[PDB]
Amino acid sequence: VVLDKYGYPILYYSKYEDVVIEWNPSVTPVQIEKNYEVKFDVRQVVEAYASLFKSRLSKLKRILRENPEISNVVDIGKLNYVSGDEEVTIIGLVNSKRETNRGLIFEVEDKTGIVKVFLPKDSEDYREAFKVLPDAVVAFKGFYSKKGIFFANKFYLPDVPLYRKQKPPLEEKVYAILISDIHVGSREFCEKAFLKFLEWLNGHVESKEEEEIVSRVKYLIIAGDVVDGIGIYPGQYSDLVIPDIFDQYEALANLLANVPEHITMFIGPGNHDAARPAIPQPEFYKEYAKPIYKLKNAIIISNPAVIRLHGRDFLIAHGRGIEDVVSFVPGLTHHKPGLPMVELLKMRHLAPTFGGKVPIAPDPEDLLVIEEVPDLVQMGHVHVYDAVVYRGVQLVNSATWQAQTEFQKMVNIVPTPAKVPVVDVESARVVKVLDFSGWC
Ligand SMILES: Nc1ncnc2c1ncn2[C@H]1C[C@H](O)[C@@H](COP(=O)(O)O)O1
Ligand SMILES: [Ca+2]
Ligand SMILES: [Ca+2]
Ligand SMILES: [Fe+3]
Ligand SMILES: [Zn+2]
């Protein structure tokens, strides 16, 4: 039985009040000038979705037009004022996508019209056109039939540039720790493993290599589902140790209070959190999430957000779009979220698909478009660790601190709890993975 305070689900044990972890005096932290900036946050800004699709198309059409190979772009509404002798390019939203034994049928829409696009079974760009999600913005080079079909010979994705200038080296080596899906309130939360991680952060390490990493750790990024929430799915009460949203954030803040002062924490919301029930999520609902807003070394970031650390862009998102990829693309699955993450980077959109349990807000501007090329992309949500480099960009899933729940077992989700990516800010790369799973 769920309860509501002003409409929001609030309720239906210890809150880590006693938890005190002090810094190891034996370890001295390397004095590095903290260079950080929130480069992008959601808060820095008839048909309900008309303005959203206009924004999405405009933004991604700009990214496509930056490809030197894309030329002779013509409006879809002008396609039969064009003779069948002229090779043209069209840019538009993938409204529908259907496979025949003879190829792929797309319904592509721009601001001037809609057109049926045919791509033959094995045009060298087929593998990519077969993977593209609907409501993504793409380009097609080909000829118009005058029967009503665009006979494409080339398919283009917004992509990431193959060539980008290398960044100048930093004065000192600095590390960033990536975590997500803590799920405080859940009986499956790896409480001991997380306490051992807080000890590790406070210089309580047993090797010289770990000691030189901990001394240089200045940033901690938390990519959503920081609490397990209330009324997220039917039967959730059977899994909750802390069945109160206020007490969940209070328990979380008591743990996160034990994070060293020399570490700057960047905390973003997820789908279990007390935040907007659609994406993008500006921040957390301050009425419920207040204890984390009061942490001295914490910065509440939006979902999504772009954090510039020492000149390196870290795009932080919860990971709702990974689900869109695994449902729509056969062959791509969890146990490896790295490849689905690459597809989102290539589409330059975090969650293009509409209709899923993925609620996309009918906002005036599309803030889910990856407008600028990041150095690192961090996502959570799927509860499985992975890391893959695509054209100099590091794609990484920060896993979870939650062991397999009753519900996860039923929907066949197998997590990899307590696997922590260690990022070298200079190269914006995962250099090590801390494994605290022995404590699960
Ligand atoms: N209803 C449902 N069916 C199937 N798969 C699901 C469902 N809800 C979540 N998930 C998956 C998505 C992630 O891989 C994992 C953790 O999501 P999180 O929501 O953070 O617990 O569970
Ligand atoms: Ca030793
Ligand atoms: Ca059973
Ligand atoms: Fe989660
Ligand atoms: Zn989630």
Numbering used by the authors: 152 to 163, 174 to 206, 225 to 619
Show sentences the authors wrote.
While the interaction between the two subunits is essential for the full activity of PolD71413, both DP1 and DP2 constructs described here are capable of digesting mispaired 3′–5′ nucleotides and of extending a DNA primer in a templated manner, respectively.
Metal ions are tetrahedrally coordinated by seven conserved residues distributed in several phosphodiesterase motifs (D363, H365, D407, N453, H500, H563 and H565). To gain insight into the catalytic exonuclease mechanism of PolD, DP1 was co-crystallized together with deoxy-adenosine monophosphate (dAMP) that mimics the 3′-end of the DNA being digested. The adenine base mainly binds through hydrophobic interactions with the side chains of Y415, V593, F589 and the alkyl moiety of K536. As expected for a non-selective nuclease, these residues do not show specific interactions with the adenine base, but instead define a pocket that partially masks the Watson–Crick face of the bound nucleotide.
